[PDB]
Amino acid sequence: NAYLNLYKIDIPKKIKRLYFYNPDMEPKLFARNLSRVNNFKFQDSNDLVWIEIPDIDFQITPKNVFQYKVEKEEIIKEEEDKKLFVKTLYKYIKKLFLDNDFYFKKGNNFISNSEVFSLDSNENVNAHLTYKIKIHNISNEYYLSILPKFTFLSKEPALESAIKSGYLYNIKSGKSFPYISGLDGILKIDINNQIVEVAYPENYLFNFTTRDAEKYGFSKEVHEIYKNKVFEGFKKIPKTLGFLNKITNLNENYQLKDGYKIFINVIYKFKNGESRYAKDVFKYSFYKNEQPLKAIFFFSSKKQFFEVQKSLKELFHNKHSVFYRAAAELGFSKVEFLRDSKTKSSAFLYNPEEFTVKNTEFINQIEDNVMAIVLLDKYIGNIDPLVRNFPDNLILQPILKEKLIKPFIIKSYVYKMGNFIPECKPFILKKMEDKEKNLYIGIDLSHDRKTNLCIAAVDNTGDILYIGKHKNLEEKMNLDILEKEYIKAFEKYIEKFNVSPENVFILRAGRFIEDIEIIKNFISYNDTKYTLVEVNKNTNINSYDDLKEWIIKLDENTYIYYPKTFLNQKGVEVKILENNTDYTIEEIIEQIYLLTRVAHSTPYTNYKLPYPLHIANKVALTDYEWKLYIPY
RNA sequence: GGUACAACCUACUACCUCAU
DNA sequence: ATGAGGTAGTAGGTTGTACC
């Protein structure tokens, strides 16, 4: 039976507000004292001081305060105000952790001062057990999600710590400040460029960046520790967090009803067979191909041409090499290297600084679909100059000089070339074969006071029908923009298939803060079945059990799928907000999982999000970088 | 940059209650 | 306007495993 890090909150769902009256003291100062001492917040009214707490035995500090309490009490049910219940509950959780000697970090992370151990690679670095807490509302009930992670801080305070870092974390405050100096027993920090001497150097600790971890040699031990000792973090939850027993019973673990966890198996359809492995594209070729592979070379200078020419000719020019072998395995008609009439040399030169080639007759009158094999000396800071400056009507395939060998790198390179050709479909998903009718679009909003919107539309095979990016400023106007973009993608689908799609899938990153009834209205009154889906990759639900390639049903409306990846499993939550299509909810969820597999960047790696959403996000993040990795 | 992703620090924006 | 105190969501940018 699969374990899940969820614990039912067995307390009344109402929260009660209590009032205190102190005649001797000023009310605001009274609320300040009480607030500081109980690790809770007290709000002061005109004449009274009040606190909002959940319906549980909440012990006030100091006990003598009982005299100031009044019989007047207000009860606010969870039904009346859900937000107040949830936020008040978060406050009580934070108070419990603080009272039980836990450090507070941003994002509801709590560090342990007791449960620390010294790293083997570096004794001065201390590993702190840490827990991430979230409140989840499923099946009309409230559950608590607990995630074990580790926070790495210096073993001893800054002045007594051999290791030094850029910033410090304050145990009591819970905030981090830039470390200026630790001279002569006084530690100074920067808060706008304001420097002060802090009273307690022992309260401040050192936090570390990845570069610091590499510099001191414990960077790899961090990853080993995360993948390796996380299981103990799950096991010791009842013993270590037993103080949380007021709201929940930790000894009882959450039990998935039978049938609520289902494993999804994906089979890739190839030309002369089918498989469950992506790399088997090499065994069974491309679903469609029989296309010529035409490419030219670009070199930073003649010196690098000669320097890499040794491995270059053996890898690329002799027919018995792995490049031709792989290209034939993928079903290419032939491999041809274009030579220009000006020089019987198929290699061309570009300047690295501006990434521009001299305009030659050959490049201007080149055929449409050719690969520019561009060799890069090192990883450069910005690759936007390469995208903008390089010739427009040519598909760009950069490769690093250092990489030029591990076979799967070359094989992945040829696969990328295959993906960028419009006529070649590498594969189609066996289960997605009958989904030609459906149109899958993803919506992403990226902020920063102006907000930019991007959407993407794909079909069952994985072809990108349309991509739309807007960098306009921040209701009805953004829904007008969304309706025009949706209409444009609709028109692109009908252009591709000469039919209006009977089913449209709308997948949005995050929650629908935008108006719903308008969206469902204008999508629906074209008699096209629609489904509105909320996808959030920030979920706290996990387990020590392996959940990769599994779909878990929290409630009938909410599911969570874990994509297959080499690293620690992290779930993605999919929620069917509304559905009028012929598909059932289970089938729709399965389709969302399939959209992650409709396309592959390489045969060996997997996408975490559905392809429409992944494209929409990648386009929203960068203006010109996304052109390199997405064919459109 | 043949690539997916995890981790980490930093930072911002919005909002909330105070309040000069 | 602007400064506390707090919560929430995400972007920049470096390093790590993994694909054989």
Residue numbers in the entry: 0 to 190, 192 to 404, 407 to 450, 454 to 479, 482 to 639
What text appears in the publication on this structure?
The N-terminal and PIWI-Argonaute-Zwille (PAZ) domains constitute the amino-terminal lobe (N-lobe), while the middle (MID) and the catalytic RNase H-like P element-induced wimpy testis (PIWI) domains form the carboxyl-terminal lobe (C-lobe). Unlike other Argonautes, the Ago protein from the eubacterium Marinitoga piezophila (MpAgo) has been shown to preferentially bind 5′-hydroxylated guide RNAs to target ssDNA. Here we present a crystal structure of MpAgo bound to an RNA guide sequence and a complementary DNA target strand, providing insight into preferential targeting of ssDNA.
In order to capture a target-bound structure, we mutated an aspartate residue to an alanine (D516A) in the enzyme’s catalytic pocket to prevent DNA cleavage. Nucleotides 1–20 of the guide RNA (orange) and 2–21 of the target DNA (red) are ordered with a straight helical axis passing through the central cleft of the protein. Recognition and subsequent binding of the DNA target results in movement of the N-lobe away from the C-lobe to accommodate the hybrid helix. The MpAgo ternary structure shows that ß-strands 1 and 2 twist away from ß-strand 3 to create a path for the glutamate finger to complete the catalytic tetrad. The 5′ region of the MpAgo DNA target (positions 5–8) interacts through the phosphate backbone with charged residues (K93, K107, and K174) positioned at the interface of Linker L1 and the PAZ and N-terminal domains. In contrast, the N-terminal domain of MpAgo does not split the guide and target strands, but instead the helix remains intact through the central channel of the protein.
